[PDB]
């Protein structure tokens, strides 16, 4: 068994299952659907990962909102600030991402762009963590995609984490 682990079998296997717990209205429903598929390819384009969407057998990664209550450690906030987040890798809880409730995400000329806000959370849902690099994707600063630019910093972390 390689070595001992912290009980949680860190996610690490092709074929992934994900299910949004509730599309958002700020943008088209079929649009949020595309912003996620594109995003899927935005991160799958850097590795032969296989994503599978479900809607009845639950999913390893569960997406939704943050709500005002929640309990995490920062209820409500509106404005930019917290835009979303996910829990460490694991089963059920590991792989879920929460998006800000009162906000305006859209695949149009909005500002957060479901494809962008998700991309970032599409990297955290995995395991990589902020590396301090500002020009990185996991960087601690929100950078809109005026030209969608990737970064090996991720191709590398996702390379040893997958291919």
Ligand X SMILES: CCCCCc1ccc(C(=O)Nc2ccc(S(=O)(=O)N(CCN3CCOCC3)[C@@H](C(=O)NO)C(C)C)cc2)cc1
Does 98 contact Zn ion by CB under 5 A? yes
Does 91 contact ligand X by CB under 6 A? no
Alpha-carbon distances, residue 70 vs 14, 73, 116 (angstroms)? 31, 8, 24
Min separation Cβ 138 and Zn ion, Å: 6
Residue 122, C-beta contacts closer than 8 angstroms, at least 6 positions apart: 39, 40, 42, 43
Does 63 contact ligand X by CB under 6 A? no
> Catalytic one among 30, 121, 129, 160?
121
Active site residue 121: yes
- DSSP annotation of 135 reads T
User: Which span sits near Ca ion by CB under 5 A: 15-23, 28-36, 95-103, 115-123?
Assistant: 95-103
**Tokens 């001992």 identify what position?**
4
Indicate the residue whose CB is closest to Zn ion: 98
Token digits for 54?
A: 């479900």
Does 124 contact ligand X by CB under 6 A? yes
Closest CA to 102 of 125, 83, 123: 83
- The site for Zn ion (CB under 5 A) is made up of 72, 98
């Amino acid at each position: 068994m390689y070595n001992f682990f912290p009980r949680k079998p860190k996610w690490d296997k092709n074929q992934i299952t994900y299910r949004i717990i509730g599309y958002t209205p700020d943008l088209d429903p079929e649009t949020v659907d595309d912003a996620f598929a594109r995003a899927f390819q935005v991160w799958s384009d850097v590795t032969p990962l296989r994503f599978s969407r479900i809607h009845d057998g639950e999913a390893d990664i569960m997406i939704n909102f943050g709500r005002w209550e929640h309990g995490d450690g920062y209820p409500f906030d509106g404005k930019d600030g917290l835009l979303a987040h996910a829990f460490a890798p694991g089963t059920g809880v590991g792989g879920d991402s929460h998006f800000d409730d009162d906000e305006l995400w859209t695949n149009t000329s909005a500002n957060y762009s479901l494809f962008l806000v998700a991309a970032h959370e599409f990297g955290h849902a995995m395991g990589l963590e902020h590396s301090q690099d500002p020009g990185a994707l996991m960087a601690p600063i929100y950078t809109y995609t005026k030209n969608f630019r990737l970064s090996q910093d991720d191709i590398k972390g996702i390379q040893e984490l997958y291919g």
